[PDB]
Amino acid sequence: MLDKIVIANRGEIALRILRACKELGIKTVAVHSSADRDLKHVLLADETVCIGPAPSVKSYLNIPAIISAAEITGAVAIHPGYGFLSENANFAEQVERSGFIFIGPKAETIRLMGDKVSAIAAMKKAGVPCVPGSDGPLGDDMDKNRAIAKRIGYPVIIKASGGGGGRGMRVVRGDAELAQSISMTRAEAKAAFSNDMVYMEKYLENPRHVEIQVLADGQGNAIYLAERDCSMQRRHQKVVEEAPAPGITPELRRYIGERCAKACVDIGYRGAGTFEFLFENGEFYFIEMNTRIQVEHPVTEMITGVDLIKEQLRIAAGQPLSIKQEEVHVRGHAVECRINAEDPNTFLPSPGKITRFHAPGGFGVRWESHIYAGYTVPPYYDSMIGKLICYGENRDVAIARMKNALQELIIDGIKTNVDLQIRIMNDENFQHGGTNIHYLEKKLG
C-alpha cells in the first residue's frame, strides 16, 4: 500500500479521500490555499503545506507548488480528486515524470478522452453507442456543413471539441442559423480553451442523463458498477443524482456496462471513470468520459458495497482488481442531494460564516461534508459545501429518508438550496421517476 499521498484538492472530496487513506493506514498530506487553513481535512491531515494564496489559479491549479509539496513531504502519490487538475494531462504527465504515482489514468488517456472528437472516435472504434454526428471536425466549407446537418437531421447541435457540459455549444434548427452558429461556437471555444475545433451532433429533444461507473487496473481488467441517473439539473449543473437509474432493466444494464468495461480494455483505462450517456427512447449515446472520480460517486457505493476511493488507491498501488464482474450486485437504491451555498432567489453563491450546523443521522443516512459550526465558506471556490446521500431497500424508502434527512439538516448564517432540495423530493414526477434533463427548469420557470 502507498506510504504517503498528497490530496490535491479541497472541500468535501479532500475529506472524503482523507478517510479512505486513514482506513488504509496511508499517511496524508493536505495542500491548501491560505484561505483553506481551517478545512476539516486540513485539521485532520498528518501533514499540511500551504501551496499559495487564496485564488485557485495560484494555489490548487499551481502544479509546480503541488509537486514541490509532494517532494518536501516525502509523498509517493498524488490524488487530484475531481475538478482542478484531475483532467489535466500535462499535470498527470509531470507527476509521473517526477516519479510519483498519479491516482488516475495515464496522461495519454486523459488527453485522448479530454478531446471530445478523439474521445468519440475511440468510443466508436470500441463499439460504444454515440450520437450521430460529423465524425470529425467541421471545415470552413458551408456546403459540406449544411449537408452534414441534412445527413443527420435537424435539430443538430454545434459543440466545442475542447469544451463540454454546455460550455461553448448551441442548438441549430434550420439552415439559416447554421452559418452564424458554427463561427460563433468556433470563436467562443477559441476564447477560453485556445482550440477552435467544433463538431456536429444530433440534438436530442428530451433525454435522460444516465452514466456508467467503471473501475479498471492498468492491467487488462475492468468492471462496471451499474449506472446513475443525473437528469435533475440546472444550467447543466447536477443538483440531484441517484443509483440505479429508474426504468433501466437488468438486461440494459448488462448491455451498456459490458460495452463500457470493454472500452476500458480497448483504451487502456486505469483507475475510476465514468462514461456519460444521454438516454432517450431506450437508446444510449455517449457524450463525454470523465477520466476521474465524480462528485456523485457515493450513490454507486451505497448500492454496490464498493469503496471507490479505496479501490482507486489499490489500483494506484498496482494491485490487480480483486473484484470479478459477477461479484458486483445492485441492491437497494440511493439518492444524493447536492448542498449548495447559494441564494434560493438569485442562485448567486452565498459565502460567509456558519453560525449553527446540525447534520442528519439515522439508518441509511450518509453525510459527506467538510462543514462544521463556525466554519467560513470563502467566495473563491465552488458553491457546493456538502453532499447528503440516503440509501434504502427501495427507491421510495430512499426518497422518504432524504425528505426526513433534509428537514433535520441545519445550516444557518448562509443561504442554501436545502429547501429547493426538499421541494424536488416532494415533486410528484420525480416520485414517479424518469424525468429528463429539462425537467427542473420547467418546474421552476
Ligand X SMILES: CC1(C)CC(=O)c2c(N)ncnc2C1
Minimum distance from residue 293 beta carbon to Cl ion (Å) = 8
Name the catalytic one among 16, 208, 292, 314. 292
User: Is the link from the previous residue into 155 a cis peptide, with omega within 30 of 0?
Assistant: yes
Smallest distance from Cl ion to CB 292, Å:
8
Residue nearest to ligand X (CB): 204
Candidate ranges 11-19, 165-173, 291-299, 309-317; the one touching ligand X (CB under 6 A): 165-173
By the 10 Å C-beta count (0-12 exposed, 13-18 middle, 19+ buried), 441 is classed as exposed
- Please, what is the minimum distance in Å from the beta carbon of residue 274 to ligand X? 15
Least Å distance, CB 236 to ligand X, is 6
Q: Minimum distance from CB of 401 to Cl ion (Å)?
A: 23
Task: For residues 89 and 110, give the distance between their C-alpha atoms in angstroms, rounded to a whole number.
Answer: 5
209 marked among binding-site residues:
yes
Cis bond leading into 379, ω under 30°? no
Which amino acid is located at 234 in the chain?
R
Q: Which does 204 bind (CB under 5 to 8 A by kind): Cl ion, ligand X, none?
A: ligand X
Q: Which three cell numbers stand for residue 201?
A: 451532433
368 binds ligand X (CB under 6 A): no
Q: Residue 97, annotated ligand binder? A: no
d(CA 168, CA 322): 41
Binding residue per annotation — 391? no
Site string for ligand X, 83-122 (x = CB under 6 A): ----------------------------------------
> Is 259 marked active-site?
no
Q: Tell me the C-alpha distance between 308 and 314, whole Å.
A: 10
Picked from Cl ion, ligand X, none, the partner binding residue 82 (CB below 5 to 8 A depending on kind) is: Cl ion
By CB under 6 A, is residue 284 in contact with ligand X?
A: no
Identify the CA nearest to 121 among candidates 267, 270, 256, 223.
267
Q: Which secondary structure element, helix H or strand E, spans residue 340, and what is its range?
A: strand 333-340
For β-strands 271-280 and 233-234, DSSP reports them as: unpaired
> Is 342 known to sit in a ligand binding site?
no
Task: Please indicate if the annotation marks 201 as binding a ligand.
Answer: yes
Q: Is residue 189 at the binding interface for ligand X, with CB under 6 A as the rule?
A: no
Q: Which of residues 225-244 bind ligand X (CB under 6 A)?
A: 236
Per CB under 6 A, the segment of 203-211, 248-256, 373-381, 410-418 that binds ligand X is 203-211
User: Scanning residues 286 to 315, which ones bind ligand X (CB under 6 A)?
Assistant: 287
Residue 130 touching ligand X (CB under 6 A) = no
Q: Judged by CB under 6 A, does residue 157 bind ligand X?
A: yes
Could you tell which of ligand X, Cl ion, none binds residue 294, using a CB distance below 5 to 8 A set by kind? Answer: Cl ion
Contact 214, 259 (CB under 8 A): no
Segments of 134-270 assigned E as strands: 156-164, 167-172, 198-202, 208-216, 222-229, 233-234, 237-238, 240-243
Is 236 within any annotated ligand binding site? yes
- Of the candidates 196, 156, 205, the residue with the CA atom closest to the CA atom of residue 178: 156
Closest CA to 4 of 101, 131, 88: 101
Q: Which residues are at the interface with ligand X (CB under 6 A)?
A: 131, 157, 165-166, 169, 201, 203-204, 207, 236, 278, 287
Active site residues: 292
Residue numbers in the known binding site for Mg(2+) are 276, 288, 290
